[PDB]
Write a structure and sequence with these properties.
Layout (H helix, E strand, L loop, with lengths): L7 E10 L2 E8 L9 E4 L15 E7 L1 H8 L10 E6 L5 E4 L9 E4 L8 E6 L15 E6 L5 E5 L6 E5 L5 E7 L12 E6 L2 E5 L11 E4 L11 E5 L15 E5 L5 E5 L3 E5 L6 H4 L1 E4 L25 E4 L5 E4 L2 E7 L9 E4 L2 H26 L10 H15 L8 H19 L3 H13 L4 H4 L5 H4 L2 H16 L3
Antiparallel strand pairs: 1-2, 1-4, 1-12, 2-3, 4-5, 5-8, 6-7, 8-9, 9-12, 10-11, 13-14, 13-16, 13-24, 14-15, 15-23, 16-17, 18-19, 20-21, 22-23
Protein name: Ryanodine receptor 1
Family: Belongs to the ryanodine receptor (TC 1.A.3.1) family. RYR1 subfamily.
Subcellular location: Sarcoplasmic reticulum membrane
């Protein structure tokens, strides 16, 4: 019950809305948007929150003298210590920026250099004092080392934001996962479900089923992003704890961001987050199909292990089994089949990171296209110019080939990674998506012609965006 280094945590805070208390977590994307925002968690039962981009890892915890000395294993956090928080997804570091939305902005930093990415911990009442072990559940105050300001929740002008202000905000460092038993399935893990080879998946990009149906498919899918799922149990705290037979959970598709569900209309499908309520979205792993405890504040008993555990998947509300009707459709059925038992294989981080990058990129460029069609016919919804420019720039660096000066053995390995990272993006329809943005923009002869249908301000980035889109297209194609 004490926070240590290399622990996954979220930074939670409280706010009152419509005479009711709402809990909010510190979230950031990194790629495309460095700025931090707040993800509400109170409404979890109706709408699953976007937890993946909330998870932070406690890298280091140092005394004021040690941090000054560095600038010149599972260690416990003490009050007065300065911490380095690493974003799980982006691999970037939580830092105090130099821009203002007299207060700075809070966001992510490419590399942990200087004092900007360090935050000191301080007791929130008389119950804790400098040098005491920081306990799980404690309220705390966080101070930016670079600016000497508080990690602060803002209520201006009419929305909830984060910044570095002279006003104080109480923060809870709720633990996600601690040391876990090696080879066991925990929450927030990204994996594949195997049958018998065959794995659970949705159809390829631009398919006729609108990506809403679920299939058992073999061949190349086992190495594609469309087959990856994130297990999300119904608890914000200790969601990263060992999964247990019978424990309810949501199964989220990574690239599409949709949730495995049972529908009165269509049956077993995949559903939008805003329509993913508990009754429809809750599944569990069963040891068998027989007729058939109390949730714990910890990692709990390790029950399900990767590869070795054969699991039956059940829908909780209906008690229906996950079965089938080489590509066969996945259905929910009362009796199912004697061979319904799946096994689970953990997906490694490079593939896992890429799948999420696809999700964020798809949604952003789809917003950019939708905004273009709105004024396509109409001459004279703000376009995400800033985010698109940064997204493009980030992915160009992501796909950038190795330096020619690097050693042959290291070059080859780096080439193989780049190729596979490209392959994942390609198989998720990224080329068409980049192309669709180019065609829409090319409808215009010059930037001024574009300014006749869009803001002159928007037109000021027209040539930049179009060059960056072509540059990405080249980087996605290059064979390496």
């Amino acid at each position: 019950q004490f926070l240590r280094t290399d622990d996954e945590v979220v930074l939670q805070c409280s706010a009152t809305v419509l005479k009711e208390q709402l809990k909010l977590c510190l979230a950031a994307e990194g790629f495309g948007n460095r700025l931090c925002f707040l993800e509400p968690t109170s409404n979890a039962q109706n709408v699953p929150p976007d937890l993946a981009i909330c998870c932070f890892t406690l890298e280091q915890s140092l005394s004021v003298r040690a941090l000054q000395e560095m600038l010149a294993g599972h260690r416990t956090l003490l009050y007065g210590h300065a911490i380095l928080l690493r974003h799980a997804h982006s691999r970037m570091y939580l830092s105090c920026l130099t821009t203002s939305r007299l207060a700075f902005d809070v966001g992510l930093q490419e590399d942990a250099t200087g004092e900007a990415c360090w935050w000191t911990m301080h007791p929130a009442s008389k119950q804790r004092s400098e040098g005491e072990k920081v306990r799980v559940g404690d309220d705390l105050i966080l101070v930016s080392v670079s600016s000497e300001r508080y990690l602060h929740l803002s209520t201006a002008s009419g929305e909830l934001q984060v910044d570095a202000s002279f006003m104080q905000t109480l923060w809870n460092m709720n633990p996600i996962c601690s040391c876990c038993e090696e080879g066991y399935v925990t929450g927030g893990h990204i994996l594949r479900l195997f049958h018998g080879d065959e794995c659970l998946t949705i159809s390829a990009a631009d398919s006729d089923d609108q990506r809403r149906l679920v299939y058992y498919e073999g061949g190349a899918v086992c190495t594609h992003a469309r087959s990856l799922w994130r297990l999300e149990p119904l608890r914000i705290s200790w969601s990263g704890s060992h999964l247990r037979w019978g424990q309810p959970l949501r199964i989220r598709h990574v690239t599409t961001g949709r949730y495995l569900a049972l529908t009165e209309d269509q049956g077993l499908v995949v559903v939008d987050a805003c329509k993913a309520h508990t009754k429809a979205t809750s599944f569990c792993f069963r040891v068998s199909k027989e007729k058939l405890k109390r949730d714990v504040e910890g990692m709990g008993p390790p029950e399900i292990k990767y590869g070795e555990s054969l699991c039956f998947v059940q829908h909780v509300a209906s008690g229906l089994w996950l079965t089938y009707a080489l590509k066969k459709k996945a259905i929910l059925h009362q009796e199912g089949h004697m061979d319904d038992a799946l096994f689970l294989t953990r997906c490694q981080q490079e593939e896992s990171q890429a799948a999420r990058m696809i999700h964020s990129t798809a949604g952003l460029y789809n917003q950019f296209i939708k905004g273009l069609d709105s004024f396509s016919g109409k001459p004279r919804p703000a376009l995400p110019i800033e985010a698109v420019i940064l997204s493009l720039q980030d992915l160009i660096g992501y796909f950038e080939p190795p330096s020619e000066e690097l050693q042959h053995e290291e070059k080859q390995s780096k080439l193989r990674s780049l190729r596979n990272r490209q392959s994942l993006f390609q198989e998720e329809g990224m080329l068409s998506l980049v192309l669709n943005c180019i065609d829409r923009l090319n409808v215009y002869t010059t930037a001024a012609h574009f300014a006749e249908y869009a803001g002159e301000e928007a037109a000021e980035s027209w040539k930049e965006i179009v060059n960056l889109l072509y540059e990405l297209l080249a980087s996605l194609i290059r064979g390496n």
